[PDB]
Amino acid sequence: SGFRKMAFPSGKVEGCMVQVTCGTTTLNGLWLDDVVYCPRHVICTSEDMLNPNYEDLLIRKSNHNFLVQAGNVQLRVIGHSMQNCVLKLKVDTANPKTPKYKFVRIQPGQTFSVLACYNGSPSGVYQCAMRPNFTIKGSFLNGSCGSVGFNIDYDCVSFCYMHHMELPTGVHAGTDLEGNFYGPFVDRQTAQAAGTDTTITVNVLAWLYAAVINGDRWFLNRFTTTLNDFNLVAMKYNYEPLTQDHVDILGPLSAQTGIAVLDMCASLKELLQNGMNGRTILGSALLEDEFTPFDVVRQCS
Amino acid sequence: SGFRKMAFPSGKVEGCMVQVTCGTTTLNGLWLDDVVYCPRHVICTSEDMLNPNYEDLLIRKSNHNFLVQAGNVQLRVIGHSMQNCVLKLKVDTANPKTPKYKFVRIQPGQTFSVLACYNGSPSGVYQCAMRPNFTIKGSFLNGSCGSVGFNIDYDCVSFCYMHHMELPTGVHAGTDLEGNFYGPFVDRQTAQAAGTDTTITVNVLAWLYAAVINGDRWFLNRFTTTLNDFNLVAMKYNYEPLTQDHVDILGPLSAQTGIAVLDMCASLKELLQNGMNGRTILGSALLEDEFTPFDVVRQCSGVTF
Ligand SMILES: O=C1N[C@]2(CCOc3ccc(Cl)cc32)C(=O)N1c1cncc2ccccc12
Ligand SMILES: O=C1N[C@]2(CCOc3ccc(Cl)cc32)C(=O)N1c1cncc2ccccc12
């Protein structure tokens, strides 16, 4: 019993964190096999703030301009290439701590653990969701660029995010491990803004099923709803539309608890109308949307 | 910017998790140097757990009755002893992954990271607090016994908790690494209840400072209070008393934000008597009490391990 925001154990990722330095800029890199991955903005100077030409800056670099440090050992860069917004530094040594890994691009609503690093050294681990507006609400300070988001499946690390920047609202933007940004963001200091954020409806429903599995039922009602009626109510509270895919995904939790998805949707509609009235659900006065249907099942079973 | 419930990196602890089996019971063990630490209830049967004589059960065991597995390698148990509610299995091999470590007993209000394990394999890491009623609001299923709580100070792991059981309210109970339970609990299947919980006041204040550091100031007011007047109000809302030690500990956050501790106390006082009024603080409609003053400083300054 009990429900917590839980991150994956970070050991397999800690053994991959290195420090990458280009001139005055120092950030984090991910050392897997003989390649160190890091945000390409490590090659930018003060003059390259608004409109950097990364191809032009990278062509002016030599291998010895990249100072890579793994612990107290300096690694030797023997090659460099750019793939979208990530820089790939070929090094003369394969990381002995390289776990079984994959690079996965995630969709909004998906969750992952973030290993926050500064100077190639891990300082903390926390859980995150990719917001519907493609930003993450992380906890990052200057120097955290190159920190990665991941999930572990058995003994395999699926790397899904690399931190790149902070938007003016304090939210964060980054890329997958292939350098493709999540969202309409670019690695430039030009005017950028996160779009209006919305609540991840399928995750709120999964969290309501987690609360039922943990013995909380106060919020349940004798009602059901159509999918369309639920969505019409949901849109009014800045909730993401709930699709037939989401309904299907909630199937196992619906079967385990005996509460049909559209039945749980009617509880959610009521909660949005009434609020909580001084009550909490899993020790929370707000509807939690950073637990996926998959997270609920693995934590509760 | 940003404030998250953040645990210490768990790598140094993952390299210590092993599986301990004694008969039908399989749980987790902490392998440090040539000793595997685990709950003493691993030696228990069905009628035993109702009223167990652990000295009598342990004396009937031989070293080969304990199957210790570190990954896919079986460790050889060459000795066994009991220290309070913890079993210590001497093994023939020192853990090469043994980090710099200490065993520390923590006080209520102090926070720590939990590495939840099943069958000697880490599955999750989460941050939590030792409640004033000596329980932890953890997330544990059957098989998680022997999972450990820890902090990291510089490059030294301080082990502070070992999970033993779940109380009827879904809250959790355990011991320090010397086997002494936190709270008035016993490691026996019997009638035990968590006492009424209270809010960790110094941690709520530390979290209000974190919110100010992140640009959330709506709750701030012109008022200040005496420590006497605040503690009278606090007791009324089941909040822990705030001591002069707590005031001194909040000093650095008070200096960084320009909000005196007793000034932040008058904000907490108003928050308790009036509520949030539909507003949130750091994306929360409740006053968070699981971030200590040190946790706030560590996260809002970026200390590494
Ligand atoms: O390290 C960087 N460089 C920045 C600064 C300039 O604007 C840009 C524009 C594009 C790019 Cl890719 C990076 C950057 C950035 O946001 N971050 C930071 C990342 N995350 C959190 C931050 C918290 C405070 C301060 C800076 C943080
Ligand atoms: O594995 C055990 N055995 C228990 C069961 C009997 O009562 C006691 C009394 C003392 C001791 Cl040391 C252990 C135990 C216990 O609570 N846990 C569990 C630990 N934590 C969470 C649990 C979630 C569900 C189920 C069992 C969980």
Curated annotation (Swiss-Prot), chain B:
Residues in compartment: Cytoplasmic: 1-305
Limits of the Peptidase C30 domain: 1-305
Substrates-to-products reaction catalysed: TSAVLQ-|-SGFRK-NH2 and SGVTFQ-|-GKFKK the two peptides corresponding to the two self-cleavage sites of the SARS 3C-like proteinase are the two most reactive peptide substrates. The enzyme exhibits a strong preference for substrates containing Gln at P1 position and Leu at P2 position
Domain of life according to the entry: Viruses
Catalytic residue list: 41, 145
Cellular compartment(s): Host cytoplasm; Host Golgi apparatus; Host nucleus
Effect of residue 205 to V: In strain: Zeta/P.2
Record-listed cross-link Glycyl lysine isopeptide (Lys-Gly) (interchain with G-Cter in ubiquitin), residues: 5, 90
Activity modulation comment: Inhibited by pyridone-containing alpha-ketoamides compounds 13a and 13b. In turn, alpha-ketoamide 13b (tert-butyl (1-((S)-1-(((S)-4-(benzylamino)-3,4-dioxo-1-((S)-2-oxopyrrolidin-3-yl)butan-2-yl)amino)-3-cyclopropyl-1-oxopropan-2-yl)-2-oxo-1,2-dihydropyridin-3-yl)carbamate) inhibits SARS-CoV-2 replication in human lung cells. Inhibited ex vivo by michael acceptor inhibitor N3. Inhibited ex vivo by compound 11a and 11b.
Subunit structure as annotated in this protein's UniProt entry: 3CL-PRO exists as monomer and homodimer. Only the homodimer shows catalytic activity. Interacts with host FBXO22; this interaction promotes the proteasomal degradation of nsp5.
Role, per record: Cleaves the C-terminus of replicase polyprotein at 11 sites. Recognizes substrates containing the core sequence [ILMVF]-Q-|-[SGACN]. Cleaves and inactivates human TRMT1, preventing tRNA guanine(26)-dimethylation of tRNAs. May cleave human NLRP1 in lung epithelial cells, thereby activating the NLRP1 inflammasome pathway. May cleave human GSDMD, triggering alternative GSDME-mediated epithelial cell death upon activation of the NLRP1 inflammasome, which may enhance the release interleukins 1B, 6, 16 and 18. Also able to bind an ADP-ribose-1''-phosphate (ADRP).
Record's protein name: 3C-like proteinase nsp5
